DNA sequence: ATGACTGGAAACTTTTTTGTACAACACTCCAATAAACAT
């Protein structure tokens, strides 16, 4: 609905603490490349960033694929949000990960990435892959206070025996010739 | 009788443990910075 209806907003995915859902989002991203051709998706891997800063310039080198530039020192919050508001460019999709680890003493770095798809020219979809540690209490104080932002929340319940036993039937019976254990040990 | 006994006798000292209140503290970060290692 966002790529066809020309819409853009935020989407906070609060996954279960440690369940291995990183491969679920990778399946959807690769299916959109073979369906539609014209858009570009920039990845994010802030595992080597021990500080709260040096995050925006790390993804500033990907402007429009073939058109790149170079940093000049102290130039954020000016050129990154300028190219996003351009209606002549394609719909850029930004992926977010471990957003809880990017906090600060006043989480000021998280006040600019959640207000871009809500001001003029909303052409950015927010996708945050992170487990459940804390909801909207101190990270995003705009909720339960401001009536401008309307985020969406989706949770994932823990898989009981209805899914763990099911995920093993299509795992061993499709690649092995004969099972090595009985059905009583699976339960 | 009032003036003499035992008989009971109300405020009232003590503590006090309760919350708060404000003391540090290791503090992550920073902000050049400065020399060094390229030029």
Swiss-Prot record:
Residues reported to bind ATP: 15-22
Post-translational modification: Ubiquitinated by the SCF(CCNF) E3 ubiquitin-protein ligase complex.
Domain of life: Eukaryota
Compartments reported by the entry: Nucleus; Cytoplasm
Function: Involved in the initiation of DNA replication. Also participates in checkpoint controls that ensure DNA replication is completed before mitosis is initiated.
Subunit structure: Interacts with PCNA, ORC1, cyclin-CDK. Interacts with HUWE1. Interacts with ANKRD17. Interacts with GRWD1; origin binding of GRWD1 is dependent on CDC6. Interacts with CDT1; are mutually dependent on one another for loading MCM complexes onto chromatin. Interacts with TTC4. Interacts (via Cy motif) with CCNF; the interaction takes place during G2 and M phase. Interacts with CDH1.
Disease implication from the record: Meier-Gorlin syndrome 5: A syndrome characterized by bilateral microtia, aplasia/hypoplasia of the patellae, and severe intrauterine and postnatal growth retardation with short stature and poor weight gain. Additional clinical findings include anomalies of cranial sutures, microcephaly, apparently low-set and simple ears, microstomia, full lips, highly arched or cleft palate, micrognathia, genitourinary tract anomalies, and various skeletal anomalies.
Family listed: Belongs to the CDC6/cdc18 family.
UniProt-recorded name of the protein: Cell division control protein 6 homolog
Lineage summary: Eukaryota, Metazoa, Chordata, Craniata, Vertebrata
Gene responsible for this protein: CDC6
Span covered, complete protein: 188 to 374 of 560
């Amino acid at each position: 609905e966002h790529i066809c209806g020309k819409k853009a907003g935020s989407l906070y995915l609060s996954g279960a603490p440690g369940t291995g859902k990183t491969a679920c989002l990778s399946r959807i991203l690769q299916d959109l490349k073979k369906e539609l051709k014209g858009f570009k998706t920039i990845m994010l891997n802030c595992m080597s960033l021990r500080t709260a800063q040096a995050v925006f310039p790390a993804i500033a080198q990907e402007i429009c694929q073939e058109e790149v530039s170079r940093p000049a020192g102290k130039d954020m919050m000016r050129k990154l949000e300028k190219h996003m508001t351009a209606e002549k460019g394609p719909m850029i999709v930004l992926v977010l990960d471990e957003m809880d680890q990017l906090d600060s003493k006043g989480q000021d770095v998280l006040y600019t990435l959640f207000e871009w798809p809500w001001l003029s020219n909303s052409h950015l979809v927010l996708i945050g892959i992170a487990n459940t540690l804390d909801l909207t209490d101190r990270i995003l104080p705009r909720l339960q206070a401001r009536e401008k932002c309307k985020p969406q929340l989706l949770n994932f319940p823990p898989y009981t025996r209805n899914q763990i036993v099911t995920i093993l039937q299509d795992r061993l019976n499709q690649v092995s010739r004969d099972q090595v254990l009985d059905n009583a040990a699976v339960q």
